[PDB]
Chains A and B, each alone.
With several copies, the nearest count.
Chain A
Amino acid sequence: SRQRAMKSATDNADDLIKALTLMANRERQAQITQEISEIVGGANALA
């Protein structure tokens, strides 16, 4: 039972790592886009 349960928990942690990495890459891209929006907004306000 412990072997089966640990295989299950390993698969679950794998799927959780995958979903969390997807969310982290989304947040990374969003941060870069938002920072560029602020920089270009300031530069266009000054132009």
Chain B
Amino acid sequence: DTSGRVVRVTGPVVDVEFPRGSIPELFNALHAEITFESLAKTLTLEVAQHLGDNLVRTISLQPTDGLVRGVEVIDTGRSISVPVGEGVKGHVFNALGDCLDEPGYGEKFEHWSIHRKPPAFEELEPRTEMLETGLKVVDLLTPYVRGGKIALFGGAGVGKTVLIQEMINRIARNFGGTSVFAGVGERTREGNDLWVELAEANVLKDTALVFGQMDEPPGTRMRVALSALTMAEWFRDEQGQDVLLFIDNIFRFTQAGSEVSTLLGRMPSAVGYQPTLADEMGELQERITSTRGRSITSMQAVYVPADDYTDPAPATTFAHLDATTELSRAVFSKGIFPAVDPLASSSTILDPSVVGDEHYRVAQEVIRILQRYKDLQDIIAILGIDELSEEDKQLVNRARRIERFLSQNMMAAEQFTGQPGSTVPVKETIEAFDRLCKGDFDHVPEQAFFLIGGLDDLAKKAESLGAKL
């Protein structure tokens, strides 16, 4: 009757012919069954182009191996819809909304289309607001933006998963919010590891995981971020909850878009990215924002091709990023957690008109001292601390103290140690680092600064080693 039939199969690209008055809308999801017993499945096809003569060109989300010309294609009448609600917490999904750890779960939930518009112009916030996380280094040197975007530049063995757990904890406890993780181009080994680590830290109940993996066609890797963002938008708008979205290698979203553009026969652009690189990046990043009092904040891992920051993909991604947190192995080796590089990380709202005058002055003094210590570190390494000047040695001591006080006892560490995590206010952090820059703690041993909170914890840790204010 009103169902279509497959006409062409060229890899992941499938052309489908419908009756004259039954052509599906663009982005609609169509279903076609592969009946070969070894490869029997149900392909979902997203309408990509209207070719004319009742033909539509669609991108398949599953491998099309075993698909026959002429088979029935059913139009669902809607785009890809994911389950939304509180029930998605603690469960793993793919870009199609299928539960991975429990198949068939969430089929009776409300379903939301993943293609949505950003908030209207009159609903946007004209005022930038800082997100008070509770970590000293973040709140001081690279303050986050509420409803903003934070690039994350940490690899393996620098505590990136610990930082993700920490932010999940802090959004769930200090804001009453929820977390959505998007694994875009996720490795299945690392996805299983993330699942197990979140279940063992008891933060999975606060997080909804959406995995579009590497062994999948480009359409799923291109739509997984929209699926996770749709869940986050339901949590923000319908539940009234601050959300934290985690995008795995946002670059892989760009790369899957480029691959889909190549498969659809579109002429490439500069370097090669799809001609609509900026448009797709904007359509995604504009839905992450504050509206009606609630917000979605996003920590996104960014891959930079060839370390070239002028490459079109990082250049288009950085047009939407508000802060940068680079996790360093040199900081991780010194035992400082989180291993945030204070000199390499940054924020666009570390500005006297956003954070204030004293915040800015204290942060800039800290950065100056740390940069001078970085300059002296090589003279110390090759020659020795004994060769330095007197003011040089004094600054070295003060800078080691500031380095170690930038560390913190994180809430992701309560699973191992057993002692809770700190939430230091901005005022206390500003005052503590002002005093540290003056020199009020140059007699305290270094170890008294490792993994503590504010100034009370500093005093009680100092007097445990035999040192007063």
Contacts and interface: CB of A to CB of B under 8 A. Distances in A.
Chain A–chain B contact at Cβ < 8 A = yes
A32 B308 CA distance: 14
Contacts of A25: 306, 308, 310-311
B262 A38 contact: no
Given A45-B262, A46-B262, A38 B268 contact: yes
Given A28-B306, A45-B262, A46-B262, A40 B268 contact: yes
Contacts of B267: 39-40, 42-43, 46
B262 A39 contact: no
Interface string A16-40: 0000001001101100110110111
A38 to B, nearest CB: 6
Nearest to B309: A25
A33 B273 CA distance: 10
Interface in B217-263: 262
Interface string B274-315: 000000000000000000000000000000001010110000
A28 B308 contact: yes
B265 interface: yes
A46 B265 contact: yes
Contacts of B265: 46
Nearest to A41: B268
B262 A29 contact: no
Nearest to B268: A42
B271 interface: yes
Interface in B310-333: 310-311
A32 B272 contact: yes
Contacts of A26: 310
A42 to B, nearest CB: 4
Interface in B161-209: none
B272 A36 contact: yes
B156 interface: no
Interface residues of A, number: 16
B315 to A, nearest CB: 11
Contact of B271 (A29, A40, A45, A46): A29
Contacts of B311: 25, 29
A24 to B, nearest CB: 9
B270 interface: yes
Contacts of B268: 36, 38-40, 42-43
A38 B272 contact: yes
Contacts of B306: 25, 28
A28 B311 CA distance: 10
A26 B265 CA distance: 26
Nearest to A28: B306
Contacts of B308: 25, 28-29
Contacts of B266: 46
Nearest to B265: A46
Contacts of A40: 267-268
A13 to B, nearest CB: 15
A41 B267 CA distance: 10
Contacts of A32: 271-272
A32 B313 CA distance: 14
A28 B267 CA distance: 20
A45 B262 CA distance: 9
Looking at B265, B266, B308, B311, the one whose CB has the most chain A CB atoms below 10 A away is B308
Given A28-B306, A28-B308, A33 B262 contact: no
Contacts of B271: 29, 32-33, 35
A40 B266 CA distance: 10
A39 B272 CA distance: 7
Given A39-B270, A40-B268, 5 more contacts: A25-B308, A29-B308, A36-B268, A40-B267, A42-B272
Q: Give the top 5 A-B pairs by smallest Cβ distance, nearest first.
A: A42-B268, A25-B308, A29-B271, A43-B267, A36-B268
Interface of B: 262, 265-272, 306, 308, 310-311
9 contacts: A25-B311, A26-B310, A29-B271, A33-B270, A38-B272, A39-B268, A39-B269, A42-B268, A46-B267
